[PDB]
Amino acid sequence: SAGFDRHITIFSPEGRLYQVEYAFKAINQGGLTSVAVRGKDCAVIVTQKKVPDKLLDSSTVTHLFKITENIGCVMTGMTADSRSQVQRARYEAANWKYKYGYEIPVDMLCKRIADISQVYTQNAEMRPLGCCMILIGIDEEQGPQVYKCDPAGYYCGFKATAAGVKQTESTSFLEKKVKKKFDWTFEQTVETAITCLSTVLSIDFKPSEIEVGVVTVENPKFRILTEAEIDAHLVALAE
Amino acid sequence: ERGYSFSLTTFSPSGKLVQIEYALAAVAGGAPSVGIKAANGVVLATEKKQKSILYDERSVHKVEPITKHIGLVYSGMGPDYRVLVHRARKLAQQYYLVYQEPIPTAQLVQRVASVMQEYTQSGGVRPFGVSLLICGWNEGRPYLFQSDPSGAYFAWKATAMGKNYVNGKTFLEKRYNEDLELEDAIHTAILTLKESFEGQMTEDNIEVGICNEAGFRRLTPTEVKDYLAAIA
Amino acid sequence: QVKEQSILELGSLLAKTGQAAELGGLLKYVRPFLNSISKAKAARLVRSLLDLFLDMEAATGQEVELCLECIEWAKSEKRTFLRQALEARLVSLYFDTKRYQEALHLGSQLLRELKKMDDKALLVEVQLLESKTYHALSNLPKARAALTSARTTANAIYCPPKLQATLDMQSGIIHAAEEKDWKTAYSYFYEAFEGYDSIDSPKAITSLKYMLLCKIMLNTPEDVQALVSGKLALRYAGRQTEALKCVAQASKNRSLADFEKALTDYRAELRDDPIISTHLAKLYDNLLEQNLIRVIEPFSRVQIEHISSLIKLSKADVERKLSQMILDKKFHGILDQGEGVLIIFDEPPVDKTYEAALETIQNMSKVVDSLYNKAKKL
Amino acid sequence: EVIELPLTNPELFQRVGIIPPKGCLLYGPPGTGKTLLARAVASQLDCNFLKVVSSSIVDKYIGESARLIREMFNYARDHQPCIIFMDEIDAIGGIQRTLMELLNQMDGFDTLHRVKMIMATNALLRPGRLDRKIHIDLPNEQARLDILKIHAGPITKHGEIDYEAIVKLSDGFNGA
Amino acid sequence: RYDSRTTIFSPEGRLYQVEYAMEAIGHAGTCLGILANDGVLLAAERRNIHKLLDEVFFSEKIYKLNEDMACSVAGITSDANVLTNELRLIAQRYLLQYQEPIPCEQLVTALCDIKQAYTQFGGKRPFGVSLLYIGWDKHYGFQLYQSDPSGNYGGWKATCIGNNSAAAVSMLKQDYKEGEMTLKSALALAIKVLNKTMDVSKLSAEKVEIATLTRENGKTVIRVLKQKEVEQLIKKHEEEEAKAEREK
Amino acid sequence: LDKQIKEIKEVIELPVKHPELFEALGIAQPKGVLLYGPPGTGKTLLARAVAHHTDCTFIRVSGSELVQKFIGEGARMVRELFVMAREHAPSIIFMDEIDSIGSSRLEGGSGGDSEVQRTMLELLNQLDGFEATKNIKVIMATNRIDILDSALLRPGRIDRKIEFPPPNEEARLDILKIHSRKMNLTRGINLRKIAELMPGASGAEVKGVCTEAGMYALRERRVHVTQEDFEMAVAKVMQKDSEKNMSIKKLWK
Amino acid sequence: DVLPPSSIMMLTSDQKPDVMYADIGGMDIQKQEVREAVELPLTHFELYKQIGIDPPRGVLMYGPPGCGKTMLAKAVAHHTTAAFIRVVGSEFVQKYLGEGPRMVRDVFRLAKENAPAIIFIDEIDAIATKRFDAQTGADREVQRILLELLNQMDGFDQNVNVKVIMATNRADTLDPALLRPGRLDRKIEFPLPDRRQKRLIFSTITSKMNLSEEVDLEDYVARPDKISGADINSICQESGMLAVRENRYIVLAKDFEKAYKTVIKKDEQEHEFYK
Numbered sequence A: 001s002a003g004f005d006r007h008i009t010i011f012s013p014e015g016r017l018y019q020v021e022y023a024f025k026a027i028n029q030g031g032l033t034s035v036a037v038r039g040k041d042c043a044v045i046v047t048q049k050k051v052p053d054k055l056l057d058s059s060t061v062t063h064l065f066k067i068t069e070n071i072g073c074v075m076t077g078m079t080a081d082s083r084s085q086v087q088r089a090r091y092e093a094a095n096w097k098y099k100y101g102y103e104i105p106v107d108m109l110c111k112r113i114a115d116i117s118q119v120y121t122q123n124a125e126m127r128p129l130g131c132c133m134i135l136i137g138i139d140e141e142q143g144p145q146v147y148k149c150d151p152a153g154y155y156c157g158f159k160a161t162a163a164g165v166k167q168t169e170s171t172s173f174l175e176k177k178v179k180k181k182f183d184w185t186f187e188q189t190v191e192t193a194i195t196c197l198s199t200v201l202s203i204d205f206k207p208s209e210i211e212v213g214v215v216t217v218e219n220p221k222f223r224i225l226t227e228a229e230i231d232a233h234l235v236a237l238a239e
Numbered sequence B: 001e002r003g004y005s006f007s008l009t010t011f012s013p014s015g016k017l018v019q020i021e022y023a024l025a026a027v028a029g030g031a032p033s034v035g036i037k038a039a040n041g042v043v044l045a046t047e048k049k050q051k052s053i054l055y056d057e058r059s060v061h062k063v064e065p066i067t068k069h070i071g072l073v074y075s076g077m078g079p080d081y082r083v084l085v086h087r088a089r090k091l092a093q094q095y096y097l098v099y100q101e102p103i104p105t106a107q108l109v110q111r112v113a114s115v116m117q118e119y120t121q122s123g124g125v126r127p128f129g130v131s132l133l134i135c136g137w138n139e140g141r142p143y144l145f146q147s148d149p150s151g152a153y154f155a156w157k158a159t160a161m162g163k164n165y166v167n168g169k170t171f172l173e174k175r176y177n178e179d180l181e182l183e184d185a186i187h188t189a190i191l192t193l194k195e196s197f198e199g200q201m202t203e204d205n206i207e208v209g210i211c212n213e214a215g216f217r218r219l220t221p222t223e224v225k226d227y228l229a230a231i232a
Numbered sequence C: 001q002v003k004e005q006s007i008l009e010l011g012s013l014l015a016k017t018g019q020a021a022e023l024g025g026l027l028k029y030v031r032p033f034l035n036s037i038s039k040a041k042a043a044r045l046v047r048s049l050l051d052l053f054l055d056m057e058a059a060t061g062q063e064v065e066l067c068l069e070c071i072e073w074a075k076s077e078k079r080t081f082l083r084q085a086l087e088a089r090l091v092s093l094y095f096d097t098k099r100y101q102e103a104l105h106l107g108s109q110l111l112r113e114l115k116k117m118d119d120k121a122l123l124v125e126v127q128l129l130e131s132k133t134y135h136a137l138s139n140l141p142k143a144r145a146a147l148t149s150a151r152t153t154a155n156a157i158y159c160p161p162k163l164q165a166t167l168d169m170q171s172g173i174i175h176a177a178e179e180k181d182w183k184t185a186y187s188y189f190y191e192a193f194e195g196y197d198s199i200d201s202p203k204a205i206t207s208l209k210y211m212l213l214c215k216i217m218l219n220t221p222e223d224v225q226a227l228v229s230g231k232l233a234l235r236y237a238g239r240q241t242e243a244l245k246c247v248a249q250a251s252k253n254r255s256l257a258d259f260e261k262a263l264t265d266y267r268a269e270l271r272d273d274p275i276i277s278t279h280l281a282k283l284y285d286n287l288l289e290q291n292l293i294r295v296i297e298p299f300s301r302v303q304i305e306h307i308s309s310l311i312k313l314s315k316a317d318v319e320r321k322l323s324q325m326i327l328d329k330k331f332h333g334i335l336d337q338g339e340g341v342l343i344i345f346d347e348p349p350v351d352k353t354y355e356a357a358l359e360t361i362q363n364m365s366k367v368v369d370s371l372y373n374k375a376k377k378l
Numbered sequence D: 001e002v003i004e005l006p007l008t009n010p011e012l013f014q015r016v017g018i019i020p021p022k023g024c025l026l027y028g029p030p031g032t033g034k035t036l037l038a039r040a041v042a043s044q045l046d047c048n049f050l051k052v053v054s055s056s057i058v059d060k061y062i063g064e065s066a067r068l069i070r071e072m073f074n075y076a077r078d079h080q081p082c083i084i085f086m087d088e089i090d091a092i093g094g095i096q097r098t099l100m101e102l103l104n105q106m107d108g109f110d111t112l113h114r115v116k117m118i119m120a121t122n123a124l125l126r127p128g129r130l131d132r133k134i135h136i137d138l139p140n141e142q143a144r145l146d147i148l149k150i151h152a153g154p155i156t157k158h159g160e161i162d163y164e165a166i167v168k169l170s171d172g173f174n175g176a
Numbered sequence E: 001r002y003d004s005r006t007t008i009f010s011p012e013g014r015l016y017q018v019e020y021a022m023e024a025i026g027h028a029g030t031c032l033g034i035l036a037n038d039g040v041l042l043a044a045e046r047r048n049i050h051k052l053l054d055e056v057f058f059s060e061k062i063y064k065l066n067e068d069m070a071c072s073v074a075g076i077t078s079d080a081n082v083l084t085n086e087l088r089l090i091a092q093r094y095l096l097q098y099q100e101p102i103p104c105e106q107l108v109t110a111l112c113d114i115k116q117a118y119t120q121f122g123g124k125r126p127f128g129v130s131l132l133y134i135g136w137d138k139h140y141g142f143q144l145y146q147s148d149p150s151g152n153y154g155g156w157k158a159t160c161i162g163n164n165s166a167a168a169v170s171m172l173k174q175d176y177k178e179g180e181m182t183l184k185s186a187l188a189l190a191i192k193v194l195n196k197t198m199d200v201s202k203l204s205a206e207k208v209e210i211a212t213l214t215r216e217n218g219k220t221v222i223r224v225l226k227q228k229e230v231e232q233l234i235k236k237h238e239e240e241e242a243k244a245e246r247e248k
Numbered sequence F: 001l002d003k004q005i006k007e008i009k010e011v012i013e014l015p016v017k018h019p020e021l022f023e024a025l026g027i028a029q030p031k032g033v034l035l036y037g038p039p040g041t042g043k044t045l046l047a048r049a050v051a052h053h054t055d056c057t058f059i060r061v062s063g064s065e066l067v068q069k070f071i072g073e074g075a076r077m078v079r080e081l082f083v084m085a086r087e088h089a090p091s092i093i094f095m096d097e098i099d100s101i102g103s104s105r106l107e108g109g110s111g112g113d114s115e116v117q118r119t120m121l122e123l124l125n126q127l128d129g130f131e132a133t134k135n136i137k138v139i140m141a142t143n144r145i146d147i148l149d150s151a152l153l154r155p156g157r158i159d160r161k162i163e164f165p166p167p168n169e170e171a172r173l174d175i176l177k178i179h180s181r182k183m184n185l186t187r188g189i190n191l192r193k194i195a196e197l198m199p200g201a202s203g204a205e206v207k208g209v210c211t212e213a214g215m216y217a218l219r220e221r222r223v224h225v226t227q228e229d230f231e232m233a234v235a236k237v238m239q240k241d242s243e244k245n246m247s248i249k250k251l252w253k
Numbered sequence G: 001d002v003l004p005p006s007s008i009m010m011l012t013s014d015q016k017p018d019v020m021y022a023d024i025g026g027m028d029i030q031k032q033e034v035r036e037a038v039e040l041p042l043t044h045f046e047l048y049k050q051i052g053i054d055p056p057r058g059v060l061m062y063g064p065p066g067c068g069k070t071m072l073a074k075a076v077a078h079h080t081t082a083a084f085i086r087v088v089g090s091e092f093v094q095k096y097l098g099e100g101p102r103m104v105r106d107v108f109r110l111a112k113e114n115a116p117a118i119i120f121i122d123e124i125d126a127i128a129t130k131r132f133d134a135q136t137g138a139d140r141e142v143q144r145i146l147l148e149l150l151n152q153m154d155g156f157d158q159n160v161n162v163k164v165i166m167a168t169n170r171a172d173t174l175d176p177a178l179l180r181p182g183r184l185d186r187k188i189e190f191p192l193p194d195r196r197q198k199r200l201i202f203s204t205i206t207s208k209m210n211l212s213e214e215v216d217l218e219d220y221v222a223r224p225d226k227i228s229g230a231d232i233n234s235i236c237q238e239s240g241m242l243a244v245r246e247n248r249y250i251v252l253a254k255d256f257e258k259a260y261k262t263v264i265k266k267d268e269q270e271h272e273f274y275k
């Protein structure tokens, strides 16, 4: 039982791959939490921005990476592998554009990412990339879309989601929230995401501890909200 | 014989490829799937439950088309299913290009089985942890085959794979008659999913596909709702 | 194809009109038509027309005659499955007409044919009919064995909701007959009630009545109110459920007068059902026994008139019940009709010493016999 | 909320029907005050408050039972209310089947004097196997001040001493 | 131990992996072939006889390799399929280069060489497929060849591999009349052997597959017996058994 | 098992009853006999039968009685057993389930059992060593004849290894008659048909079928078992657990 | 003089499990089989003698966990007039080779001394695996324990008047020797409750509970979820405890529904790709 968890290509006695689950758990090593909420006409994601050192450069720590002007990603988990996967995703989007013209839909983009991860998991050559890849982006004819697609190679469509240490609690909070059908507006979506993160983390959420990125139908370009916009959204949330 | 339950390229003393059996167990530990072959067409049904209401049920489809007249439903590891379906589509289109005729269900199933077996012959490559169930209508005769990680393929008339497959097989051989029609086959498949289905069978939780002479098509939530209401 | 549907519609209309002779004439005329059509379709048409003919209340005594004519004609035409279906319907008709012995013999004859043959649905139906007829004749062990065989054959084929409801109802009846486990009887009756409700069959009300009777038999009358005012039971509210409710209330208050009044009022809904009638009579006997035992505890020489007044029953009825109770080693005492009292004493134990002494006397007598066998040698 | 209601009003528990509230768990960081929780809640009752931390109750197999499972409830009854406090169950005899049989034995059959087992370490989580589970958070810095004040009370300090900035530079995350 | 990989030699000098494969070949379903003066035949047992399984190919164990060859199979399904595909490729390649049918033994030797190469080079597990070969060639005519997982083939007049291969082979040796068997007699002997080689009584026609090689007017027709003739042969064997018990 | 019974009595009865025959023949008296076969074939039944018509001490040793915890307790127990058997000579020692002690010898190291090995070595010396036992015959019954080390199964410690194949048709009929003697059979209870319905019965499964028929009779509250009851008992006791997963069954074509 | 005579378990009169057959909800077939195999012979041996069938000596309950095997064992223990001994398979496997089989033979000898007796080996799945060609001492110890149990049950010294009851969950990984018609005559299956046994279990567990008029257990019984009896008991206890938490002594529909939703949840993580 426990002797089958040293190689990624060896099946456990009950029909399990232990290394993939181990990478899933490693996702939490960063100690961060990220949440995505898909509004009626917007997609908003908020992730913790931990800077436990005065000498760090807060501008170079942001975890929100822009794969493309129309598609967005937030890497949660191991930093190096997350950045490697973000670079691979940028390459995949560029190649899709170069070979087929139209911008690769987010679902396809990290479906390719997840296929790469799965091919990694099948052939025992490289340790699976221990970093959850949350994608957002407005898609014509399908409204806002947020897709989480992970080391083992599973990608699904999400109305709301989260990856990180506090994933179960955040998803339970979203389920409690996502059910009371209501106007999913830009401001409402950002407020719900920030509220879910605050309750899960139980933190006052100072403006310098969070980083937000929103894609909207009106402006279908990934935008990273500055400190002022985040603070205004927080003050609106409080009152 | 715990010493030989590790490598796929070594023979156990009794002569069992242990890793293939373990992969088959992993397949049987997946999501349910049942398919029935009717004299008029074929029916494929899988239970599509997401762990929470936060998952877009329409983003990932367990039943996917390989060509205009071939289908695919699985029971096991979905990420492996994605590569399996990609290989199946490539094989079907290669056959079409070389022969300019839609690949017959038998040949596509055989080539998919060969692809599966390709991974069960060298150390460092994990056997495909998913058993595919292929629909089809070639030469005016409905087809249903199951390709396993071991590479073997059969011609199942009607079977259920994944969790609670024993109960599904027992239900079959009871409500299955060799002279049914597509609607009755759909009803039997829905019932078979029901007897191994936990919770309410919503339109977004059960995905079905008819694969008759007209071709393979994934029933939209509307038709599934109508069928379930008729059965319910 | 059109002819079959037209004939079915005409038969339905005629059965509405009750022209049984006309129905038989149409059947005989169409006899050749079956030879011109498929075997399964012809058998289904004949079965449907025959069922419609039996549905009408025109029990002029020609129902069994028509069934026999149809079975013989089918045997002439060599339709094994159609003949088996006709025989099963004839067995059901014999049950309904209360001619169990002929129904029993026909079912026994047809059971072997259905067992060798692979049509297991008709086999399950015939075994259930045989179990019901066996129960109606008081042969509970054989009836339960037949029902167990029917259940075994049913858990090998597709049991439609109607067949499942019939099996559950009959097995609940059998369990109730064995007055030892009423919870399982109530569970089976609830399963049958749900199966019948999902089909809208008229037997749902009968299943509900049996459920209420099972609830009463468990010394839990209060649950009847909850059951009747349920999400599914509401649509069936009426005379029968209200009669069961009144009987449950009478049992709850534990008053013989209320029980007798309830039985007298709802005579049709309580005395026309053999299961309900027998079980309610047994419950009445138990209630009378308990009440009489309770009312004689303080007395030692109570006069019969006073005890009858206390129980609110006729003097003769209380006298007969007390006599039966005494004659059956129940509460100890002796009646004296000369003036009328129910004397109660303490029943001296038996003085086991005398039993032991008598046994020792017998043993010593046989030892003396053995010594007689000895002493022959002088 | 877990040990007060069962102790005070067994009638309301018996009125509803659900008798056994036993179970409980305090999984979290090691030794951050786990014993103290069972001590602070000992404000009322909790007299015996025995500790059997990972030892004498199953011992891998059954090593300990009755004389190491009942003798417990024994004094746990011939006396005022007490807490078994089978702390650190993650080190018992260092087996799972014995433990499963351990927690499903006559233990809850008696449940004498409202004695509630309070195991704390790190389908056995369902009712009848493990009651409410609480995860002890790492010592919060704002709480860290609370700890330094109470812990540092006895030591002879001077007036200028400040328990304010220590936590900012003291985030050891362990009570000890 | 000395069975970690095929390349490892035991101290006594035994390829433990090859022996393990040749032992595991016993799990496969029973197949046999009797060489007759006018032709050769093959018999196989369908282990999977579930009612829900649709028979679409009718040749699960008996495959056609060339216009004058056919080979039954016994062993792993994937290995069997790969071996049959390679057999067809080899036969057609030989036909293309030489423009005449492979003389049977050439195909057998090619497959045995492939299997030997697998059992020699490290990182490859031995092909656990032992398959009987039948065919006719201008050099020796009708022949039946046995292939083992180790690549060691051999000419044979009647052999059975798979379940209870030992009993079937022994009682074929007991009652095989050399040079005096006709195709009808060969089929009778094959049915007799299959009747007790498998535990299932009555030798159901659906549970047995028989293919025969005949030399008709220079065509080498490979015929797979239809269920009707299989049932006829089963009934003939039943009547023969009744006649034999008549002596009792 | 007439042949098996005669073969066993040739070693357990003839050598001790009439040793003069062996003295005249010039052959050494066979000492031990080993019973091996499919489970529930009748080995322990034959052992009990020999213990019945024995007129001789019939010391019994189970599988784990000679294992013991303290080192040297197994060897001491075996030595005391053989000394007591010799003192009460003649004697027969029955070692049921000799698979426990007497398995194939394993090397040293943590894996090896060692102690059971020492007990088995003590037994081996006792049965055939420097001191030759006189009038002590050992009957050991154990399934899996191939696992016993090739020292306990040497043709000097175990002379006759009688096989116990699952009863054939006539054997099954005889067993049914043996176990149905006290049953209340009904006319038309043909036992040949019932036996034909048991193709490979372990031998004790025949008794299981008889007991199941009796249990059906009890459940119906009668005292006679009919043929249908026997058929149902055969269908029940002879239940088989197939693979039930076509994927695994189809691996081997 | 000769002085008059618990040891391992030897279930004492004051140690009875305290569970009546009525408490066990809806196991008529299994109840009847267990009574026929372990209870009826002790009392009604006359029927067995009249039919001369040598009543079955062992029963092996097998099925999904939490279906109610141990409760049936407890009920037989409390309703039985014979000595009841309960052991768990994990107990037999001990260090100090020679203690597992020693304890097995000790339990069987104890049953023999005070007979009639019932020996219950629960979770015998531990030492029950198909005997393989053991190659290590630890591997051979479990096989030795199994051999000792087999010899004790149907061996040279027939027990007579002692019945052995075993409960497992696989029933197909067990050694064919144990499932021989002479050691485990009856193999009673305990399938997960269907729409019926679920209702009886709900009514039996709810019988003691205060409950409320507005609570219709039929609403929950008909739900397609496949839950064992242990799941039903957990649902009832959780609903009652939720009611108590809100300072309500009456359990209503909302609390029962919340408890049912909580209990049904058993996927946990599942990692989202195994399915």
Ligand SMILES: Nc1ncnc2c1ncn2[C@@H]1O[C@H](COP(=O)(O)OP(=O)(O)O)[C@@H](O)[C@H]1O
Pocket (backbone or CB within 6 Å): D030, D031, D032, D033, D034, D035, D036, D087, D147, D174, D175, D176
């Ligand atoms: N939050 C706290 N409040 C008070 N004392 C604490 C706290 N955390 C740790 N301690 C100190 O640590 C010790 C408690 O350790 P404990 O949690 O019992 O270890 P373990 O969990 O291994 O039993 C006590 O001596 C106590 O003084």
Ligand SMILES: Nc1ncnc2c1ncn2[C@@H]1O[C@H](COP(=O)(O)OP(=O)(O)O)[C@@H](O)[C@H]1O
Pocket (backbone or CB within 6 Å): F001, F038, F039, F040, F041, F042, F043, F044, F045, F046, F167, F175, F178, F202, F203, F204, F205, F207, G154, G155, G182
């Ligand atoms: N040939 C036979 N004759 C009579 N009874 C048999 C025969 N074979 C098996 N049995 C019955 O099967 C049961 C098996 O018991 P046992 O002798 O312990 O089997 P084993 O020798 O396999 O341990 C016995 O009670 C016996 O009555």
Ligand SMILES: Nc1ncnc2c1ncn2[C@@H]1O[C@H](COP(=O)(O)OP(=O)(O)O)[C@@H](O)[C@H]1O
Pocket (backbone or CB within 6 Å): G023, G024, G025, G026, G027, G064, G065, G066, G067, G068, G069, G070, G071, G072, G167, G201, G204, G205, G228, G229, G230, G231, G233, G234
């Ligand atoms: N029929 C039943 N009636 C009441 N509770 C039941 C029933 N079946 C199962 N249970 C619940 O589960 C327990 C019995 O399951 P158990 O026999 O312990 O399962 P297992 O044998 O798999 O360990 C009961 O104590 C109760 O909690």
Ligand SMILES: [Mg+2]
Pocket (backbone or CB within 6 Å): F043, F044, F096, F141, G154, G155
């Ligand atoms: Mg034995």
Ligand SMILES: [Mg+2]
Pocket (backbone or CB within 6 Å): G069, G070, G122, G123, G167
């Ligand atoms: Mg249990």
